[PDB]
Amino acid sequence: DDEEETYRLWKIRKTIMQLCHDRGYLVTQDELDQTLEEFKAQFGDKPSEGRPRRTDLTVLVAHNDDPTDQMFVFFPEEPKVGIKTIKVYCQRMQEENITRALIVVQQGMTPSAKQSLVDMAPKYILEQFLQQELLINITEHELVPEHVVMTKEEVTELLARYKLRENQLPRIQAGDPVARYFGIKRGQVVKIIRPSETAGRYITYRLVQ
Amino acid sequence: GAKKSAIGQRIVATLPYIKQEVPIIIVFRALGFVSDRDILEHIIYDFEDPEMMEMVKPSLDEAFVIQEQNVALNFIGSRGAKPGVTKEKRIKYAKEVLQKEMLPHVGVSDFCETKKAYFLGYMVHRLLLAALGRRELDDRDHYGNKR
Amino acid sequence: AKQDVIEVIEKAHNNELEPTPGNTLRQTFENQVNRILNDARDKTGSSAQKSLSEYNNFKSMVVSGAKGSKINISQVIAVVGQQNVEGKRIPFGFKHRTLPHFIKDDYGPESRGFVENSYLAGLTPTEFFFHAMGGREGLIDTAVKTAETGYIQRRLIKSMESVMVKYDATVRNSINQVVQLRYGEDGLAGESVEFQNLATLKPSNKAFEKKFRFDYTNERALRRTLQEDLVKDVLSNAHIQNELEREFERMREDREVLRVIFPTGDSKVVLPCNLLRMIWNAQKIFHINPRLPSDLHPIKVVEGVKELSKKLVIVNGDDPLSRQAQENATLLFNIHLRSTLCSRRMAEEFRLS
Amino acid sequence: PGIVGIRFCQECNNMLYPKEDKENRILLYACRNCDYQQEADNSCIYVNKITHEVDELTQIIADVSQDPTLPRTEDHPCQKCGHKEAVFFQSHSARAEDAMRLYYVCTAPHCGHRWTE
Amino acid sequence: RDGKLAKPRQLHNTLWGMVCPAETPEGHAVGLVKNLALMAYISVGSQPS
Amino acid sequence: EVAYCSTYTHCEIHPSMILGVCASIIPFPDHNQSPRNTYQSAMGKQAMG
Amino acid sequence: HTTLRKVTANTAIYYDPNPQSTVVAEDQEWVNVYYEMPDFDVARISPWLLRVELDRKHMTDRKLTMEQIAEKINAGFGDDLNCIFNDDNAEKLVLRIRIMNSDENKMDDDVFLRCIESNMLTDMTLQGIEQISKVYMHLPQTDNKKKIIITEDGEFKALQEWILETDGVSLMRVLSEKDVDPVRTTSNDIVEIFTVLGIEAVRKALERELYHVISFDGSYVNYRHLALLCDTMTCRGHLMAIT
Ligand SMILES: [Zn+2]
Ligand SMILES: [Zn+2]
């Protein structure tokens, strides 16, 4: 019904506000914790024949260090999206001068659009999130250890201490649900901090390739 | 699929010396029974049981297109070890298949086409009982099945 | 037992048997008959093990674990019990009956393979055959599993064969690619470790502060467990008392880390050296009288573990990256080693000189 | 409802097929190899029992009473002729759902009465 | 002999009296080779004339 | 007095004829765990005599 | 996963020239009730009837509403299909079905209507998640499945709470549903943990599975040797079979 679709729009918004917080974008403490009724107050309950249309749910968050960088989280209203639809979004990113943005797809992306995202590496980057992949925050599962993306200064100092070439670390492929979560690009290195029952803690480094 | 869903369960025979499968009611008309009342008279020994009737029905609709004996033998001979150049080379070939290599313990000679009709209908009858579930599937290891 | 199986069987003929949720009526019947017959052979087994005299030789080989198990005594004296094929009670090889002797649709205990005779009284003809059907399943498994367990043993070796602990102590396969930063994440060979309890984990919050706290307020209890020079020393110095409140703060910080690493509160850990044995060995070698007050200064217990923990080095470096990677490798050991060597336990339980 | 059943043509003895009369709105059966038509008396066509609660008393044969390998009790007398011997057995049917119900078959010659308790 | 399928190997109720339950080789041949029971007499055949 | 079956149509000559030639030499075979009559079947064929 | 065949007693296809005919005895009552004010019949009513029965046992077991089934059938197939149903008052629970009214405004009908049935009985998906065959409910007596909370006194208190255990796995949708615990839910299947929770979750969920088969017998193998096998497999970045 429209109570379920109002509840779904409550998770998706909440879980995304945790992405933006974990990627280091400025997110107010009030936006992180929203009671459903407070959310139902702001965006008004039933989406269908109702005030939330799946648009105006868009999120603009600015990075902590750079106020200029920001990002968008777009919610398409269509079941599937196509190059003509993305070209609308990319025309909006051009309009407002940003670079990075997210897309939350209801069902799937047309096979012609997926390559269109890759078609722009440098100028604009876009990321496909299925509507389900955000229904739950996998960072909070018990199986997934704490991941930390590492600065370039720290990877140089790392590889000097253990005297490693970059390709001698373990890998985590860029198609990995915890790579997408942290918006990681090929060549960055991530720091897995997980508690162990022998050492009591252990720190693994994964390269992203 | 659209056809698989509508038909239900179809029965097929895999004969010796034939490349691929053949529908069943084609095999009874090949043996000289034109009507579907005679075909279903050998398979289903009591017509007052509709549960079997509904089991066979979708296998008549698959064989509906070939209504004649000599059309059916040609349907078989197309699939033989090698396709006959001339048609009547195939009908002569398929008839030699049903006479010899078909159930030879019943009989090898001529009018046995009737003797082969009941018993071959009895394979198709006993395959229904295990489809309806009125009998137990035979046991591979039951040592009365061994020689 | 065989009379309680006839009632369960009679209840199912009249349909009075109600299926357990998630179970076919055949699944609930095959369970209730197994619940009865197991209690039978579990009762007659324990009734036979009570009867054995102290001079019995079976009891001599079982009690010391030399050979045989308590379940072999049961089958010799008491009952051999149900015989199973593929985890199910004996099936129907004929049509609806197990052997030509039995009547069709006999689910009773005798027809389906329960052997009520013991190897000593000897098995009856059919029980001999069913017992042979349950033993064939043992011979077959032993012939089949060995060839699978040997094809897996060969695959695990060829994939791992070249992984080795390099002189950096980093574990690296044949290419130099890093499998682990330290072997096993603690960097310790597996043959010298033992089992141990943490003992800071899983007491109550009220008892924890009772065992590890070192209350100096009494001035009486301290005279009891500590020499006359030292208790006058501990009461006077405000600094000494400050250092001991710091140590107990580090035990709470570690008690909060343990409850993060060990949910379910399993306290049994594997660590390199046994502390409770070596504290126990240094009581006997030095002839310590635990009735007497100890001479060991409660600070030199604290300053001695801090100076110890620096001399246990898994990771060698001065870098802030090397420091952080040792505190993690020795984390759960320094936590354990500050539980047992705590300044209070040395004053009360151990009384080391 | 009924489990319905087949009908055969009277000329070529083929399977009649149900079809709709568009003018009179009356269900018909027509062989596809001739023009023979017949009006549908039953008005039901395809019926399928999924729950398939099945009456075994219809499948049971009275000859079963001659098998030595089946048990029998004099507890349950025959309902018709009042005969004491009754030879009882279970479904003996695959896909019976869950039934341990006993079916009874009366012994003594030619009675053959078959009941269930 | 290679096959790991255990159904052909297991001892079957139809082997009562016509095949020895205990006697059987071991190793890969377990249960595939079977001795005969004492009384058991294999039938030589005849004509059903 | 409690009738299991009143219909018995055949009686067996002796129950111990269900055992083959190599398992017929074991004394008291019903008193042994079942693999132990199978092993003797293997070691009864290897005996010097 | 509940297909409409789970709750269906029997099915029959009837030929009705007009609905008020009611070749069946009982339907005539409530049939007219809906046709006193008949709606969306404006085009015409297809003659071919599909009348299904619903066992009240399986209907009340899963807490299903006739209105709920009416919605999913009408929603699944759209307006090509019309659905009409009893109140619970009926001792025999019936759901009538007919071909599209506007279809009257190939495939024949009775053939096309039987093709709908054999598609419905399997494909309807009334409730639940396809590929989930069964789900068992029990209170675990093992301390691994028992929720264990630190009380206000710092003690460990093992709580008994109901847990579900499914036959068959689709992990991504199970986690998403309300009241299901996101954190502690887990499957034994690896590849569906790989594609959902990442390669790190496989590194842990593999050493939890290997430690289960090895220590189930009561035997004990050191944790060092488990963790190296799970390190060699997943250190390439993806699941590496040993093959
Ligand atoms: Zn006709
Ligand atoms: Zn009678």
- Cβ E35–F21 below 8 Å, yes or no? yes
Chain G, nearest residue to B8 by Cα: G118
- Cβ F31–C128 below 8 Å, yes or no? no
Q: Tell me the residue type at F43.
A: M
Q: Does C155 touch chain G (CB under 8 A)?
A: yes
Residues in chain E: 49
Q: Do A116 and G169 form a contact (C-beta atoms < 8 A)? A: no
Cα-based angle G11, G14, G20 (whole degrees, multiple of 5): 120
Q: Tell me: do A128 and A150 sit in the same domain.
A: no
**The CATH fold of domain D4-48:** N-terminal domain of TfIIb (2.20.25)
Question: What ranges in C162-227 are assigned the alpha helix state H?
Answer: 205-211, 221-225
- Cβ C137–E4 below 8 Å, yes or no? no
Pick from C159, C177, C204: CB nearest G155:
C204
The total domain count for chain A is: 2
Q: Which residue has 């089934």 as its token pair?
A: G69
* Of residues B27, B36, B24, B16, the one with CA closest to residue B128: B24
Q: Do C244 and C302 form a contact (C-beta atoms < 8 A)? A: yes
Cα-based angle B25, B31, B36 (whole degrees, multiple of 5): 40
**Boundary residue ending a domain (A107, A136, A165):** A136
A5 vs B42: CA distance, rounded Å:
60
G147 vs A52: CA distance, rounded Å:
39
Q: Tell me the residue type at G78.
A: G
Q: How far from G7 is each of C25, F6, G3, G57, G94, CA to CA, in Å?
A: 19, 47, 8, 8, 12
D84 vs E9: CA distance, rounded Å:
46
Backbone dihedral angles phi then psi of residue G43, each to the nearest 5 degrees:
-55, -70
Angle, helix C238-261 to helix C331-340, in steps of 10 degrees? 130
Q: Tell me: do A77 and A152 sit in the same domain.
A: no
- Cβ D50–G109 below 8 Å, yes or no? no
B39 vs B57: CA distance, rounded Å:
12
B140 vs B133: CA distance, rounded Å:
18
Sheet holding D27-30, edge to edge: D17-20, D27-30, D37-39
Subunits with at least 3 CB pairs below 8 A relative to chain A?
Answer: C, G
Q: Tell me the residue type at D77.
A: P
Size of interface C-G (CB pairs under 8 A): 59
Q: Tell me: do A58 and A145 sit in the same domain.
A: no
- Cβ C128–F29 below 8 Å, yes or no? yes
Q: Do D91 and D54 form a contact (C-beta atoms < 8 A)? A: no
Pick from G8, G13, G55: CB nearest D45:
G13
DSSP chain E: ------TTTS--GGGTTTB-SS----GGGTTTS-PBPSS----------
Q: How far from C67 is each of C54, C73, C118, G219, CA to CA, in Å?
A: 17, 11, 20, 18
Question: What ranges in C50-124 are assigned the alpha helix state H?
Answer: 57-63, 70-73
Q: Tell me the residue type at D66.
A: Q
> What is the SS3 assignment for A71?
coil
* Of residues G108, G21, G136, G126, the one with CA closest to residue G65: G126
**Boundary residue ending a domain (A136, A158, A191):** A136
> What is the SS3 assignment for D49?
strand
Subunits with at least 3 CB pairs below 8 A relative to chain E?
Answer: B, C, F
Q: Tell me the residue type at A9.
A: L
- A125 forms bridges with which residues in the sheet? A100
Domains of chain B: 1-147 (3.90.1110.10)
What long-range pairs does C164-171 form, CB within 8 A, spacing at least 24?
C168/A162, C168/A163, C169/C314, C169/C315, C170/A162, C171/G228, C171/G231
Q: How far from C38 is each of B120, C28, C34, C41, CA to CA, in Å?
A: 50, 15, 6, 5
Q: Which CATH number fits domain D49-117: 2.60.40.10, 3.40.1800.10, 3.20.20.60, 2.20.25.10?
A: 2.20.25.10
Q: Do C1 and C40 form a contact (C-beta atoms < 8 A)? A: yes
C333 vs C271: CA distance, rounded Å:
7
C223 vs C331: CA distance, rounded Å:
35
Tokens encoding B38: 């005679």
**Boundary residue ending a domain (A88, A112, A136):** A136
Chain A residues whose CB is inside 8 A of the G190 CB are none
Q: Which residues in A129-167 are b (16+ Cβ under 10 Å) and which e?
A: bebbbbbbbbbebbbbbebebeeeeebeebbeebebeee
- Cβ C94–E13 below 8 Å, yes or no? yes
**The CATH fold of domain G1-124:** Gyrase A; domain 2 (3.30.1360)
Question: How was this model experimentally determined?
Answer: cryo-EM
- Cβ B5–G118 below 8 Å, yes or no? yes
Q: Does F18 touch chain C (CB under 8 A)?
A: yes
User: Phi/psi zone of residue G22: left (φ > 0), alpha (ψ -120 to 50 degrees), beta?
Assistant: left
D36 vs D29: CA distance, rounded Å:
8
> What is the SS3 assignment for D104?
strand
DSSP B72-112: HHHHHHTTSSS--SSHHHHHHHHHHIIIIISSTTT--STTH
Cα-based angle B12, B18, B19 (whole degrees, multiple of 5): 90
Backbone dihedral angles phi then psi of residue D25, each to the nearest 5 degrees:
55, 55
Cα-based angle B91, B92, B97 (whole degrees, multiple of 5): 90
Resolution of the structure, angstroms: 4.0
DSSP G95-135: EEEEE-HHHH---TTHHHHHHHHHHHHHH---BS-TT--EE
Largest CA distance in chain C: 95
Domain enclosing residue A167, as ranges: 137-209
* Of residues A27, A34, A19, the one with CA closest to residue A101: A19
DSSP B21: -
C283 vs C290: CA distance, rounded Å:
9
Chain D residues whose CB is inside 8 A of the G9 CB are 49-51
Secondary element (H or E) of residue B12: strand B12-13
Q: How far from C10 is each of A21, C14, C37, G127, CA to CA, in Å?
A: 67, 7, 16, 38
Backbone dihedral angles phi then psi of residue B62, each to the nearest 5 degrees:
-80, -30
Tokens encoding B1: 């699929």
Q: Tell me: do A106 and A158 sit in the same domain.
A: no
Tokens encoding C36: 């009865």
Within 8 A by CB and 6+ apart from B61, the residues are B7
B42 vs B122: CA distance, rounded Å:
8
Find the B123 Cα to ligand 1 centroid distance in Å. Answer: 28
What long-range pairs does A188-192 form, CB within 8 A, spacing at least 24?
A188/A149, A188/A150, A188/A155, A189/A149, A189/A150, A189/A155, A189/A158, A190/A147, A190/A148, A190/A149, A190/A150, A191/A147, A191/A148, A191/A149, A191/A150, A192/A145, A192/A146, A192/A147, A192/A148, A192/G200
Q: Does B143 touch chain E (CB under 8 A)?
A: yes
* Of residues G57, G25, G60, G48, the one with CA closest to residue G96: G48
Within 8 A by CB and 6+ apart from E45, the residues are none
CA A113 to chain centre: 19
* Of residues C237, C235, C197, the one with CA closest to residue C336: C197
* Of residues A146, A141, A192, A137, the one with CA closest to residue A169: A192
Q: Tell me the residue type at G56.
A: R
Size of interface B-D (CB pairs under 8 A): 39
* Of residues G101, G80, G92, G116, the one with CA closest to residue G35: G101
Sign of the alpha-carbon dihedral angle for G230, G236, G238, G243:
negative
Q: Which residue has 């018709």 as its token pair?
A: D80
D44 is in an annotated binding site: no
Angle, helix B112-132 to helix B50-62, in steps of 10 degrees? 120
For chain D, give every domain's residue range: 4-48, 49-117
CA D99 to chain centre: 18
Tokens encoding B10: 């179809």
DSSP A122-181: SS-EEEEEETTTTSS-GGGSSSSPEEEE--HHHHHHHHHHTT--GGGS-EE-TTSHHHHH
Q: Do strands A171-172 and A202-208 pair parallel, antiparallel, or not at all (unpaired)?
A: parallel
